[PDB]
Amino acid sequence: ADSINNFLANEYLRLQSHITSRALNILKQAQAYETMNQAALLQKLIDDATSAIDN
Amino acid sequence: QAPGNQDKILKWISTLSNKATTGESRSYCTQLSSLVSFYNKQHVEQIPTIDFNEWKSVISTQGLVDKVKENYESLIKEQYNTDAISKQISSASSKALDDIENELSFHAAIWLNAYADYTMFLFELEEYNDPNDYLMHENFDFFRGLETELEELTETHNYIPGAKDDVNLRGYLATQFAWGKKVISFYRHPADDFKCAKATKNMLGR
Amino acid sequence: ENNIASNTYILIQQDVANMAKAYVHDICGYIDVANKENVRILSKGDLI
Numbered sequence: 001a002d003s004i005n006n007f008l009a010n011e012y013l014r015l016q017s018h019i020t021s022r023a024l025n026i027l028k029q030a031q032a033y034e035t036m037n038q039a040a041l042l043q044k045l046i047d048d049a050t051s052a053i054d055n
Numbered sequence: 056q057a058p059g060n061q062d063k064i065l066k067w068i069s070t071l072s073n074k075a076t077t078g079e080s081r082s083y084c085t086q087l088s089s090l091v092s093f094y095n096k097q098h099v100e101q102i103p104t105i106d107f108n109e110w111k112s113v114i115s116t117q118g119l120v121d122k123v124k125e126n127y128e129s130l131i132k133e134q135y136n137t138d139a140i141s142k143q144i145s146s147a148s149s150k151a152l153d154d155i156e157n158e159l160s161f162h163a164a165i166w167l168n169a170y171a172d173y174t175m176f177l178f179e180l181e182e183y184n185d186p187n188d189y190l191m192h193e194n195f196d197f198f199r200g201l202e203t204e205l206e207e208l209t210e211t212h213n214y215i216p217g218a219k220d221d222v223n224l225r226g227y228l229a230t231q232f233a234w235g236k237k238v239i240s241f242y243r244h245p246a247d248d249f250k251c252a253k254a255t256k257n258m259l260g261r
Numbered sequence: 262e263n264n265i266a267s268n269t270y271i272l273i274q275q276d277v278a279n280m281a282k283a284y285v286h287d288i289c290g291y292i293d294v295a296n297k298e299n300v301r302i303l304s305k306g307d308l309i
């Protein structure tokens with residue numbers, strides 16, 4: 001009985017860490033893409049400037 | 056919770072392992088110890104707190120930070136139901152386990168009957184002191200059964216002292232300095248005669 | 262006297278083979294209880 005109670009107890013925390021870790025990774029991972037979209041948008045502006053020089 | 060909750064669980068497994076002598080039993084102890092360590096493994100990783108307001112402010116996709124929060128919180132509410140498990144394990148479990156539950160219970164009853172025998176003997180022995188101060192027929196009453204055996208030796212005419220005793224210690228004490236030191240042979244009756252005789256080509260059976 | 266394979270009623274315990282074997286066959290059976298619970302809790306909804 002004490003081994004089952006300690007198993008579900010520690011296992012409950014492991015699941016809690018799994019969720020919060022997932023919710024944090026998905027957020028940080030999304031932020032990574034968001035920064036990439038911003039850099040791609042500004043990169044086009046620089047690309048437009050370079051093309052204007054060539055013209 | 057974390058500290059001191061497994062101390063007792065280590066003493067039990069240790070003794071169970073010490074009693075194991077055959078390699079087969081030692082193997083089962085390893086399997087048993089693994090499951091205990093597996094179930095009793097402690098988990099401490101400092102579950103981090105999420106501040107959705109911080110992420111919501113710095114940068115996030117519209118509706119994403121809120122959708123993650125509401126969905127995240129929903130699962131945090133769910134938790135294990137320790138009550139249901141607590142009952143089933145205590146009501147009945149492993150009908151195969153009942154095999155040794157009833158084996159060790161009868162095994163213990165065997166050695167509890169012996170423990171009571173030696174205990175009750177030492178209890179009755181308290182009133183018996185100085186055998187040399189009791190009369191003959193009173194001592195035989197303390198050791199009820201000797202008179203019955205004594206009648207068996209008499210009615211069968213086994214009146215050679217110590218014939219039916221495997222170790223006739225009384226026979227050795229009387230022969231400590233006897234000529235031709237010998238004790239009566241086991242179960243020797245004063246009437247049996249296994250003597251033989253033969254006639255050969257020579258005289259005197261030689 | 263019916264459901265124990267022994268050549269005598271004078272039971273003498275000199276090893277814990279029969280004891281530990283029945284414990285691993287019992288405590289192990291209750292494995293997957295927490296993982297099974299995680300299935301229900303996690304299959305409830307998708308975080309995304």
Ligand SMILES: CCCCCCCCCCCCCCCCCC(=O)OC[C@H](COP(=O)([O-])OCC[N+](C)(C)C)OC(=O)CCCCCCCCCCCCCCCCC
Binds near residue numbers: 234235
């Ligand atoms: C008091 C009133 C009533 C009295 C009633 C009579 C009571 C008699 C008490 C018992 C006497 C027993 C004598 C046995 C002697 C055996 C000694 C021995 O073992 O020898 C060892 C001896 C000595 O070995 P030992 O190791 O035993 O002793 C060594 C002795 N020292 C220490 C000195 C070295 O070796 C032998 O084997 C020789 C055997 C010779 C036997 C000769 C004796 C024969 C007589 C017995 C037959 C009589 C039958 C009568 C039947 C009549 C029927 C009508």
